[PDB]
Amino acid sequence: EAPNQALLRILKETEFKKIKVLGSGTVYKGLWIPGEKVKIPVAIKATSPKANKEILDEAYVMASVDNPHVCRLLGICLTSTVQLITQLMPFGCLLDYVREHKDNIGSQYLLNWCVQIAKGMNYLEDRRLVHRDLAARNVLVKTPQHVKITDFGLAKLVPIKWMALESILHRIYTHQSDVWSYGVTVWELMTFGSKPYDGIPASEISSILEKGERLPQPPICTIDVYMIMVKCWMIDADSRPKFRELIIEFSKMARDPQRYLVIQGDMDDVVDADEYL
Numbered sequence: 001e002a003p004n005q006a007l008l009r010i011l012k013e014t015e016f017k018k019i020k021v022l023g024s025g026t027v028y029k030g031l032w033i034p035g036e037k038v039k040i041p042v043a044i045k046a047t048s049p050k051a052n053k054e055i056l057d058e059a060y061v062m063a064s065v066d067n068p069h070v071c072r073l074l075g076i077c078l079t080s081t082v083q084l085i086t087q088l089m090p091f092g093c094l095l096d097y098v099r100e101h102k103d104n105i106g107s108q109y110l111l112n113w114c115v116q117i118a119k120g121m122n123y124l125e126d127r128r129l130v131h132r133d134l135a136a137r138n139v140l141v142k143t144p145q146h147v148k149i150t151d152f153g154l155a156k157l158v159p160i161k162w163m164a165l166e167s168i169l170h171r172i173y174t175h176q177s178d179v180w181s182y183g184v185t186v187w188e189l190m191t192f193g194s195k196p197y198d199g200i201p202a203s204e205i206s207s208i209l210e211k212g213e214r215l216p217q218p219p220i221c222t223i224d225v226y227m228i229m230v231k232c233w234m235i236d237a238d239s240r241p242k243f244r245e246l247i248i249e250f251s252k253m254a255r256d257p258q259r260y261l262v263i264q265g266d267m268d269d270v271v272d273a274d275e276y277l
């Protein structure tokens, strides 16, 4: 019942200058220059009424969040096509980043990522927001020490292998069903990008989950870290941990990361979007 007094900035297409392509809708990269004497690295993500109705729903959610660990919208552009202008995350998504750098990611970085994602989801819970699509592919990286949650095409208030059981069976998505997807996300990071339930077809996922089976313990994980992941996968959603508790637990472990993760080897006027307020 709180008024979403967020702001939706409409941006002239002459304000930003595209440079290269990132993904193909198609995601682009460029610089947004607001008369402001400043350059901002951005990511600039045809007639289908539902394609616009969903794209603008994403822009609604991104514009209504503000947190160090949640990607925020800088604005939208209403030209021949609707564009979403967001903060440029130079290192891509965390899934690709954890796969390309398997042999240079240490326990401190892994546990720090778990804390930051739990902080991001804890903010979304403050905003009465259920993500419904938490995964390693949907967490972006601006620096190796700073990640944010993104991709709110599902967010409210199909990815079977990330959903809570109640979601797969009863279409029920709660803040606690995000905790389930969080545990799968941490599993992706602790396995350096392994596909969850690789092989097992999605037709049998809800059946093996009802049999009690979960994802195996990743090799680098002490039982302390894996216990937390297992707790995110209990059938009673209320027994699952809270994001505010996951922050506390993973932060305690980030104070001594080698005790809980056993890993072998432990332009001119440019401003960042996070300094443009």
Ligand SMILES: C=CC(=O)Nc1cc2c(Nc3ccc(F)c(Cl)c3)ncnc2cc1OCCCN1CCOCC1
Residues within 6 Å of the ligand: 022, 023, 024, 027, 043, 044, 045, 058, 062, 084, 085, 086, 087, 088, 089, 090, 091, 092, 093, 096, 140, 150, 151, 152
């Ligand atoms: C199809 C792939 C793809 O889009 N990647 C990227 C997506 C980004 C993004 N997405 C987005 C999400 C939700 C939104 F609402 C909007 Cl508006 C945008 N936002 C910001 N920065 C991004 C940077 C990306 O790549 C970085 C280059 C690293 N690469 C090359 C070197 O190796 C490592 C990977």
